[PDB]
């Protein structure tokens, strides 16, 4: 009934940013992003100043569709 | 970045975000002693995104279509 | 501190805290026109506390062993 998007060792912020091990989530819509406890990062280290706020904002948006701008 | 200190001012008609980089040492993650702070800006219809950067900018490649749902 | 401006970057493997001293006059408390703003850092097992600074540091002397209880 709900469009479930699996974690597959990916976080929502990593899929937002474009992790090379998370490139399969590009332009993907969901109704529930199920994050896994085995998730990690394999890119440049980063530190979001408001991580919970950004994560809740993207989860409430519920889409990863991205339009390139020149 | 060819200058001693950068400065980033990403602002709209309804908000303003000025962030200065903090040069220093960090514990190494994946053999990287540097960090990246991730910020977000939301542009309403009729609003204008303006980006200033003397340096140290991790520039965006476009926009994510934020919406409201379940 | 022999320098015109200080800078403290107390960082760990999952968070960073960069502060800047604010030189200026303040109302006197106990014949002291200066203040010391107190920050804290929590280091999880496996993380590394990297305190790097160039001045204006009120250095720690150890850890306080926070726990969970009643
Ligand atoms: C920028 O603006 C701020 C305004 O807040 C100024 O700060 C004030 O500066 C004055 C002048 O230094 C301070 O006044 C001093 O107060 C001290 C504490 O007073 C208490 O203790 C004494 C006993 O020691 C009691 O008698 C008193 O009732 C208080 O309980 C005093 O000890 C100082 O006395 C010194 O000067 C007198 C001469 O006036 C001598 O006779 C003494 O021996 C002693 O050397 C002095 O009176 C004041 O406290 C500051 N804070 C405030 C909130 O007013 C900055 O100075 C100013 N800076 C610049 C660069 O302009
Ligand atoms: C991460 O997930 C992929 C597929 O989901 C898997 O092939 C890979 O082995 C996982 N990484 C680790 C370190 O197990």
Query: How would you characterize the largest beta sheet of chain A?
Result: 2 strands, parallel
Number of strands of chain A: 3
The assigned structural class of chain A equals: alpha+beta
**Distance between termini of chain A?**
38 Å
Kindly state the percentage of residues in helix of chain A: 10-25%
Strand content of chain A: 5-15%
Oligomer: part of a larger assembly
Shape of chain A: globular
Largest interface (C-beta under 8 Å): A-B, 24 and 22 residues
Radius of gyration of chain A: 12 Å
Element-level helix/strand string of chain A: EHEHE
Number of DSSP helical runs of chain A: 2
Largest beta sheet of chain A: what is the strand line-up?
1-2
